[PDB]
Write a protein that binds this ligand. Structure first.
Ligand code: ADP
Ligand code: ADP
Ligand code: MG
Ligand code: MG
Ligand code: MG
Ligand code: MG
Ligand code: MG
Ligand code: MG
Lengths: 306, 306
């Protein structure tokens, strides 16, 4: 018998439905590439039993905490099963937007001005210093949970008195949140596959930002790949993303989200270490422009595992 | 029936002998406190089996990667067992001196000037540019692996032409290495227990730095607790350590190592999320001076767990 591969999909995060779609596509893609792969949903199957179940290797198609944040990676390390994507530290770090931003700023990489808040800071009342820092960002701002994906818990604030509503929403999803300066765009994303940086994609939502609807349900979002940048700027963007990726310590494959601001500079938003892999997701779109079918892409991601 | 507690000790790192000593102390302290505790060494016992063995909670007294770096924490999270100390992300970051330094720099906290190198860079041979950056640090410098403890793999470089030998050593111990400005001292450490910062300790080794012998095997090291700082200065140190702790996201307990430099300012060296607990160890000294028995200290660390 050749290796048996578990495609972990679904799980229990806010991104469960996205992950069910990613894993459905990855399962078929791997089987098309001759890989003996099976779907396993950790919501229904105890993943501590994977080795007992006869699996040799794991393709992680989970998104969000519990699959993307180092916890599952640590279990798999101790179980001794090779797995796709980044290891424990870089997965945990990339899930935490607050600490990714601090790390990048420490490395001299460009990030949007921001204020971080804990639940205790917000619900016990903002200090004068915090209020001053928030005021200095101007409006609009965007508010995000630190540890979500798929634009869950995120919103744009257009009036001072409505910041509290954005903060209450974000605190429904995490214990720590970010208030960030609004960036003008345009918006890009850059996939990484092994040592290869894939062609950037320019993303144009029809509404206010690339929210859950714009990501998964709209026929109106526009995508440009190639992204239409002057060659030197595409190269700059690729080099920025490579430095962001290596600073975090990520490996295997992933996708970094980036926006221009009205000063003409790129700013890093976040890194994703288990990116969406629905048929129509962004990593497959960039890989298609670099000559890879979806099956070729997933077989390559798997080949990179330990 | 009362909880059955596993004290994890020993393991397979360079710090194994220290950990066997830490775990022996912790075990006696817990039992002295009425806790039903038992030692388990992961080198001898398959730790993925703890819950199957009837354990309810885990006291981590391991030191170094694979006990301290988030991997074990992730496994315990998926097994559903509460455990002492920091979670996955903060454990992983605290083991990674390079990324701790970047995060702290991003947060505006004081860190010694440094250069980082990867193994691939070292194997290729160093560029004129990298040598230029290293040269800017001045001399002396210390060379350390990023992810070790107990002063393993470290050397003091007092001549420019001695750097290569120091790197050849540190690369035996990690794939990422730091070259840091040599700090004048004096040297301090600060224990954290729950929400409490304990009074600091001034550490005076007899040799060139606080090396493995000075830490565990010498009767010549001196320790001062209280540290002899002016009241405002002790308060400054505690505040710095609290910020450094909260920036990494650490919880439960730990210990942060700090040095003065010749500008009279404090600089953060590193955080340790499973600190030593031996008769030579620093957390027990801070707890003793703060009016706790060692048994009360370990019962408290356990009570703080999840
Ligand atoms: N500072 C910002 N200004 C404007 N739009 C932003 C900003 N940060 C994020 N966005 C928008 O919100 C989307 C989701 O933000 P991101 O930081 O990538 O979190 P997620 O993990 O949920 O994708 C982005 O794709 C972009 O459309
Ligand atoms: N930049 C430096 N200058 C002078 N001494 C240092 C410096 N960095 C570390 N040391 C010495 O080396 C010891 C161990 O370094 P540390 O960074 O705490 O790593 P470890 O995890 O091995 O303890 C310190 O306790 C201190 O005596
Ligand atoms: Mg994301
Ligand atoms: Mg995103
Ligand atoms: Mg240490
Ligand atoms: Mg020589
Ligand atoms: Mg002794
Ligand atoms: Mg130390």
């Amino acid at each position: 018998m050749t290796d048996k591969i578990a495609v972990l999909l679904g799980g229990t995060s806010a991104e469960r439905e996205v992950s069910l779609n990613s894993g459905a596509a990855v399962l078929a893609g791997l089987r098309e590439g001759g890989i003996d792969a099976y779907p396993v949903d950790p919501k229904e199957v105890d993943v501590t039993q994977l080795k007992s179940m006869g699996f040799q290797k794991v393709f992680i198609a989970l998104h969000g905490r519990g699959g993307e944040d180092g916890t599952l990676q640590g279990m798999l390390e101790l179980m001794g099963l090779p797995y796709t994507g980044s290891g424990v530290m870089a997965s945990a770090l990339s899930m935490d937007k607050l600490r990714s931003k601090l790390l990048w700023q420490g490395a001299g990489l460009p990030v949007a001005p921001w204020v971080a808040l804990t639940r205790a800071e917000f619900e016990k009342g903002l200090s004068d210093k915090q209020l001053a820092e928030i005021s200095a960002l101007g409006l609009p701002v965007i508010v995000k949970p630190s540890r979500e994906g798929s634009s869950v818990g995120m919103s744009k604030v257009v009036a001072e008195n409505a910041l509290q509503d954005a903060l209450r929403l974000a605190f429904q999803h995490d214990e720590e949140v970010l208030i960030e300066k609004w960036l003008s765009g345009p918006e890009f994303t850059v996939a990484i596959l092994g040592e290869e940086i894939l062609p950037s994609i320019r993303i144009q939502p029809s509404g206010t930002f690339y929210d859950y609807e714009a990501k998964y349900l709209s026929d109106e979002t526009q995508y440009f790949c190639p992204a239409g940048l002057e060659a030197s700027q595409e190269a700059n963007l690729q080099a920025l993303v490579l430095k962001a990726w290596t600073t975090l310590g990520c490996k295997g494959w992933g996708r970094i989200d980036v926006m221009l601001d009205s000063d003409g500079q790129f700013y890093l938003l976040e890194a994703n270490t288990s990116p969406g892999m629905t048929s129509h997701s962004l990593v497959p779109m960039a890989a298609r422009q670099a000559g890879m079918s979806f099956s070729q892409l997933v077989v390559r991601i798997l080949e990179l595992a330990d």
